[PDB]
């Protein structure tokens, strides 16, 4: 991660503003936008009964909120959140690939990145400071991808 200080200030101001939307926001809105980018993501996260699906989305938002909160508070050295992100990615390796209807692949996280970047634009902006969000989202989804791909490559087929 290489954010400039003006980028760090802008990201923190907009993030804390976004968190004002609710306990699990903006995480929930980010997941919902990924559902729009790719409805298969929704089919997977909402797999099962109405309750099960909603609980899974809630838990996803809860954990992502914690990881993001920690990352943003620690933009100076985020090794802890790096491990956490790789671990989260790792959790998407399932012996039966279509256990949840559609298999997980790294491309889903690229779509998630697009969804998240779109949301950041909704949260005194300049192109240079806004690029702080692009850096953060790329970092986050890259660590998720590495966690998943390293784990999936190692698993039996
Ligand atoms: C990119 C699209 C994503 C899809 C389609 C997806 C879907 C799923 C599915 C189907 C499971 C297995 C069912 C379950 O354990 O609840 C799971 C597990 C998990 N996911 Fe995701 N997820 C996505 C992104 C993320 C992200 C960004 C995070 C970051 C926090 C995350 C964190 C986790 C964790 C921690 C588990 C293990 C849950 C547990 O053991 O209770 N996922 N995910
Ligand atoms: Pr592990
Ligand atoms: Pr298999
Ligand atoms: Pr592992």
From Swiss-Prot:
Residues 2-149 form the Globin domain. Heme b binds at residues 60, 92. Induction: By anoxia. Expressed in the head and tail neurons and nerve cord. Does not bind carbon monoxide (CO), nitric oxide (NO) or CN(-). May play a role as physiological sensor for oxygen via redox signaling and/or electron transport. Belongs to the globin family. This is Globin-like protein 6. The lineage of its organism: Eukaryota, Metazoa, Ecdysozoa, Nematoda, Chromadorea. The gene is glb-6. The chain holds residues 195 to 355 of 389 of the full protein.
